[PDB]
Amino acid sequence: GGFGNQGGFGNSRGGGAGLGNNQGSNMGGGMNFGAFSINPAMMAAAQAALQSSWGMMGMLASQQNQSGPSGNNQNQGNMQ
Amino acid sequence: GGFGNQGGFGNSRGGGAGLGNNQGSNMGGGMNFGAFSINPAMMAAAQAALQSSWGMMGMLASQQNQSGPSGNNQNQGNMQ
Amino acid sequence: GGFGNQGGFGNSRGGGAGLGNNQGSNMGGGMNFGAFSINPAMMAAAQAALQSSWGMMGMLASQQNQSGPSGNNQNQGNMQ
Amino acid sequence: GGFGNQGGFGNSRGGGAGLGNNQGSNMGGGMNFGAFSINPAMMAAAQAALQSSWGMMGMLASQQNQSGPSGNNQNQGNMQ
Amino acid sequence: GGFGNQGGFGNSRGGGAGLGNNQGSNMGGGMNFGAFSINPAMMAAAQAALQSSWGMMGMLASQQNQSGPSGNNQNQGNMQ
């Protein structure tokens, strides 16, 4: 058998809706997703840190260090 | 048999709705998802930290260190 | 069997809607996505840090170091 | 079997909508995407850092170092 | 089988809409994308740093160092 393989999606008259087959990956931190819809309305706001991993080896090493956001200012306006 | 393989989804007349087959991965921290819908309305707000992992080995090592967000300011407006 | 292969999507009368087959990758930090829709309306705001990985080896090494955003100012206006 | 191959998408009467088959790559940090739509309206604002990877080896090495944005000012106007 | 090959997209009556088959690449940091649409309206603003990679080896080396933007000023006007 293989190593680390991923089959396809939505074929041969595909259908349905979702999130599938993620390895070591990040989805979010301020994001909107709309499809096949009528009059959608969405709002997102995030202050965040994300860290992820798949298959990691190490010897006398240091791997993945993250220091988050600090000391920022932000302003977004209105939408009529 | 294989190592770390993932079958496909939504094929041959696919259907239904969901989240499946995630290994060592992160989904969230401020996110909206809508599909095949009429007049959806959604709001999300997050202050967060997320950390995840699959298959990790280590010897005389340090792996995955995270310091979260600190000292920020944010403002989002209105939507008529 | 192979190593690290990914099948295709949306073929032979494709259909449906989603996110699939990501390895070691990042999706977000301020993003909107709309398709096949009527009168969509979306808002996103993010202050963030993201880090991701797939298949990593190391010996007497240091790998992936990230220091986030610090001390910025931003202003976005209105949309009639 | 191969090494690191990716099948095609949207062929032979393609259809549907999404994000698929990413290896070691980044999508976001201030981005809008619209298609096949009527009267879309979108706003994005980001202060961010992103880092990603697929298949990495190392010995007496240092790989991927990132110091984020610091000390900037920005102003965007209105859209009637 | 091959090494690092990518099939085509949108052929033989192509259709649908998306982002697919990226290896070690970056998409964002202030970007708008519209197609086949009526009266679209979009705004993006970004302060960012992005770093990405696919297949990397190293021995007594240093690879990928990035110091982000610092100390800038910017102003964009209005659009009636």
UniProtKB/Swiss-Prot annotation, chains A, B, C, D, E:
UniProt region (Disordered), positions on chain: 61-80
Known outcome of mutating residue 15 to S: In ALS10; also in patients with frontotemporal lobar degeneration with motor neuron disease
Description of post-translational modifications: Hyperphosphorylated in hippocampus, neocortex, and spinal cord from individuals affected with ALS and FTLDU. Phosphorylated upon cellular stress. Ubiquitinated in hippocampus, neocortex, and spinal cord from individuals affected with ALS and FTLDU.
Comp. bias (Gly residues): 1-23
Record-annotated membrane-spanning stretches: none
Signal peptide positions on this chain: none
Mutagenesis or variant effect for residue 35 to T: In ALS10; triggers mitochondrial DNA release into the cytosol, which is then detected by CGAS, leading to activation of the cGAS-STING pathway and autoinflammation; slight reduction in interaction with PPIA/CYPA
Residues annotated with Phosphoserine modification: 12
Effect of residue 51 to K: In ALS10; triggers mitochondrial DNA release into the cytosol, which is then detected by CGAS, leading to activation of the cGAS-STING pathway and autoinflammation; impedes the development of normal limb and tail buds and increases the number of apoptotic nuclei when expressed in chick embryos; does not affect the interaction with ATXN2
Tissue: Ubiquitously expressed. In particular, expression is high in pancreas, placenta, lung, genital tract and spleen.
Top-level taxon of the source organism: Eukaryota
Modified residues (Omega-N-methylarginine): 13
Bias-annotated ranges (Low complexity): 62-78
Location in the cell: Nucleus; Cytoplasm; Cytoplasm, Stress granule; Mitochondrion
Annotated function: RNA-binding protein that is involved in various steps of RNA biogenesis and processing. Preferentially binds, via its two RNA recognition motifs RRM1 and RRM2, to GU-repeats on RNA molecules predominantly localized within long introns and in the 3'UTR of mRNAs. In turn, regulates the splicing of many non-coding and protein-coding RNAs including proteins involved in neuronal survival, as well as mRNAs that encode proteins relevant for neurodegenerative diseases. Plays a role in maintaining mitochondrial homeostasis by regulating the processing of mitochondrial transcripts.
Disease annotated for this entry: Amyotrophic lateral sclerosis 10: A neurodegenerative disorder affecting upper motor neurons in the brain and lower motor neurons in the brain stem and spinal cord, resulting in fatal paralysis. Sensory abnormalities are absent. The pathologic hallmarks of the disease include pallor of the corticospinal tract due to loss of motor neurons, presence of ubiquitin-positive inclusions within surviving motor neurons, and deposition of pathologic aggregates. The etiology of amyotrophic lateral sclerosis is likely to be multifactorial, involving both genetic and environmental factors.
Assembly information from the UniProt record: Homodimer. Homooligomer (via its N-terminal domain). Interacts with BRDT. Binds specifically to pyrimidine-rich motifs of TAR DNA and to single stranded TG repeated sequences. Binds to RNA, specifically to UG repeated sequences with a minimum of six contiguous repeats. Interacts with ATXN2; the interaction is RNA-dependent. Interacts with MATR3. Interacts with UBQLN2. Interacts with HNRNPA2B1. Interacts with ZNF106. Interacts with CNOT7/CAF1. Interacts with CRY2.
Domain-level remarks: Consists of an N-terminal domain (NTD) and two tandem RNA recognition motifs, RRM1 and RRM2, followed by a C-terminal glycine-rich region.
Name by which UniProt lists this protein: TAR DNA-binding protein 43
Organism: Homo sapiens
